[PDB]
Amino acid sequence: VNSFSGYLKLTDNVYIKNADIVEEAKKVKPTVVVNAANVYLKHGGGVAGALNKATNNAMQVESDDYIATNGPLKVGGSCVLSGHNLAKHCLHVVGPNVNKGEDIQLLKSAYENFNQHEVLLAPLLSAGIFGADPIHSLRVCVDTVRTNVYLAVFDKNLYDKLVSSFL
Ligand SMILES: CC(C)(O)[C@@H]1CCCN1c1ncnc2[nH]ccc12
């Protein structure tokens, strides 16, 4: 039993809700919140910009030190950093950005990072400003993640389409 509330159950391990991931994290304080990161950990917009803003830019300061030490992530890769005031940890995961010409096949690799964590709050990888089809991202999530994932979908209209079209 966990403290996630109001989710629709899609499969044995995947749950979905129309919600702002920032407000969800602040309420639940999950062990792991997933960020929709880029390889530079430059948290400018979308989920990343919103999460970072909610940390008063502390996420960006920590991220800049991480990059200065380690260099950029790989597309499809991840790193674990602090969750600041939002969660214990933030798993920064880089899905392919179609608006940069990146290979959508890397979306499965991106979701594989979730399997290293028993329970996560997360957005749909590569959706929104990353330019992929959210229906496809949900399918890849369900077919790749085996741990317990609670998906927050910001746009109510998109949420209804994801639910109604889910196979
Ligand atoms: C599918 C996406 C890209 O993840 C959705 C579609 C709109 C934005 N986005 C978000 N989802 C959850 N929490 C969020 N907080 C700020 C933005 C945001």
UniProtKB/Swiss-Prot annotation:
Q: What is the name of this protein?
A: Papain-like protease nsp3
Query: Where would I find the Macro domain in this sequence?
Result: 1-167
Query: What is known about what this protein does?
Result: Responsible for the cleavages located at the N-terminus of the replicase polyprotein. Participates together with nsp4 in the assembly of virally-induced cytoplasmic double-membrane vesicles necessary for viral replication. Antagonizes innate immune induction of type I interferon by blocking the phosphorylation, dimerization and subsequent nuclear translocation of host IRF3. Also prevents host NF-kappa-B signaling. In addition, PL-PRO possesses a deubiquitinating/deISGylating activity and processes both 'Lys-48'- and 'Lys-63'-linked polyubiquitin chains from cellular substrates.
Q: Which organism is it from?
A: Severe acute respiratory syndrome coronavirus 2 (2019-nCoV)
How does the protein associate with the membrane?
Multi-pass membrane protein
Q: Where in the cell is it found?
A: Host endoplasmic reticulum membrane
Q: Which catalytic reaction applies to this protein?
A: Thiol-dependent hydrolysis of ester, thioester, amide, peptide and isopeptide bonds formed by the C-terminal Gly of ubiquitin (a 76-residue protein attached to proteins as an intracellular targeting signal)
Give the recorded effect for residue 164 to L.
In strain: Gamma/P.1
Q: Which gene encodes it?
A: rep
Notes on how activity is controlled: Inhibited in vitro by GRL-0617.
Report quaternary structure and partners: May form homohexamers. Interacts with N protein.
